[PDB]
Amino acid sequence: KKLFLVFWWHMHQPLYREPYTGEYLLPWTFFHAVKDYYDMPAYLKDFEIKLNFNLTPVLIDQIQEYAQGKAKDVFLEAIRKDPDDLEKEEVEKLIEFTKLNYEKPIYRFERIRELMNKEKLNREELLDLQTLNLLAWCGRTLRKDLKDLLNKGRNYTQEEKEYVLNKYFEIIKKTLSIYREIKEEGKGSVSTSPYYHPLIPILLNPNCVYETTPNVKIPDFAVSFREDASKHVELAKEKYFEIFGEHPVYMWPPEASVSNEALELYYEKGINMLATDEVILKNSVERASPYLRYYFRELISVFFRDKTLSDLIGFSYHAWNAEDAVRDFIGRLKKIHESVDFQPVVFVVLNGENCWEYYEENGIPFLEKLYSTLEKEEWIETLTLEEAMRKEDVKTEVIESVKAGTWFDGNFLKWIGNKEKNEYWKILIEAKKKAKNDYILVAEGSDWFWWQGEEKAPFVEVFDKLFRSFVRRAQE
Ligand SMILES: OC[C@H]1O[C@H](O[C@H]2[C@H](O)[C@@H](O)[C@@H](O[C@H]3[C@H](O)[C@@H](O)[C@@H](O[C@H]4[C@H](O)[C@@H](O)[C@@H](O[C@H]5[C@H](O)[C@@H](O)[C@@H](O[C@H]6[C@H](O)[C@@H](O)[C@@H](O[C@H]7[C@H](O)[C@@H](O)[C@@H](O)O[C@@H]7CO)O[C@@H]6CO)O[C@@H]5CO)O[C@@H]4CO)O[C@@H]3CO)O[C@@H]2CO)[C@H](O)[C@@H](O)[C@@H]1O
What we know:
Elements: E1 3-11, E2 23-24, H1 28-37, H2 39-46, E3 52-55, H3 57-67, E4 72-73, H4 74-80, H5 88-101, H6 110-116, H7 123-136, H8 142-145, H9 147-152, H10 158-173, H11 175-184, E5 190-191, H12 200-204, H13 226-244, E6 250-251, H14 260-268, E7 273-276, H15 278-284, E8 293-296, E9 300-304, H16 307-316, H17 322-338, E10 345-351, H18 364-374, E11 380-382, H19 385-390, E12 396-399, H20 419-432, H21 439-442, H22 446-451, H23 460-474
Helix pairs in contact: 1-10, 2-11, 3-10, 5-7, 7-10, 17-18
Bound molecules: a molecule of 7 linked components (GLC-GLC-GLC-GLC-GLC-GLC-GLC).
């Protein structure tokens, strides 16, 4: 009797490329590419288990742009430049960016603490700040090549910094290939999402917000987004086929978001399986075991992730020592295993790039201990998505209706329902009436609405500038 364990690491970045200037206004795609997007699948070279990945098409577009040397990245130019050539504005952004990341364990360099305690910075100190910002995002693979520079800790030259950049761009150029490689070796499945990561249920039917939050106020949706919802899915299928050579039969719905109408859309577009959130399961059915393969109206397979295990990795285990966290994780799988007659299916689904920066050593002690330990538990079988979709010896159940929501509390309030978030929807609704091109699809990505109307964090104004630029460009 086995427990079936399915990791599904979701990788996404909204489009940071401003459409009028072509500049990448935040460097987060570059930094998560060099730290995580290559290195998360690359674990499969060293550990013989199954791990699955989701890549949004908008992320893939940006990785390709960086791999070609085409990406004009404003912050990265502030890193690359000799400090003598830095504008005052570029020095401020470098200092701001350091302070934002300063308490993260990946930034724990003695030299950074000293630099941030100085009132002014000369060229040598700025060179250190530039290079250490780069070295802080070093991924597992380059830890070996760059160990000399990591141990040096200070007194970096312009040529050492350019060496690090050259090795980082080599990593980016290999990033799409490693996803192809682990798929072709059978080591993991790769999925995608609707193209710009929108909230499909709201594009199809905004009234679905009332199923969980009946008293919320939303704008007047006087235009249809339903064919845009189709286009997001259709364009992602085309991109996926081009990159990976298959029609996608599974997709990750952005923010785990589902509704009855969204499930019908996915099925109509040929999607046979997806996953979503446990809170949605509990909001929708009575005997709500998340260890079953569900069939929505006998038409599309639906797994519900184990929210606790997914949240433990995402939010809690960063502060634990690696042995304790892995013992706790395995102990929780043991409890699941002993609590049921059948072979349970355990989906662990979370973002694959955002949590590691809070773990000691960028999560490498934790993930190496976890994957090493899973390799030796005979009663746990890690599965690809294809295997989980087809495994015959699992328990199943038919489900006829879901309560629309997302993995944020089972509802849509992170993206709609207050004055500021509603103002973005109103802008989009008005722009949709005059849209002439697919930049209206870009503006439907969930991220713009996520950041809107929150407490003012650094660079939040950049997301707003991008959103409105795509909305403006869509109408021309
Ligand atoms: O809340 C305040 C916040 O303050 C601090 O966080 C700081 C960061 O420390 C700082 O670096 C910066 O954030 C940067 C970030 O570093 C950049 O990489 C980038 O963020 C990207 C991100 O990297 C991308 O992956 C993408 O994020 C999408 C994501 O792909 C998508 O799946 C979804 O994911 C979030 C989801 O919507 C949330 O509900 C939650 O998910 C949880 C649920 O909460 C929970 O209930 C549970 O069951 O499951 C869920 C899954 O784990 O978190 C998910 C993120 O992991 O949406 C996001 C966002 O759309 O794109 C973003 C960019 O859009 O840019 C940012 C901003 O510059 O600044 C922030 C804030 O200042 C603090 O350390 C942190 O803990 C606090 O949360």
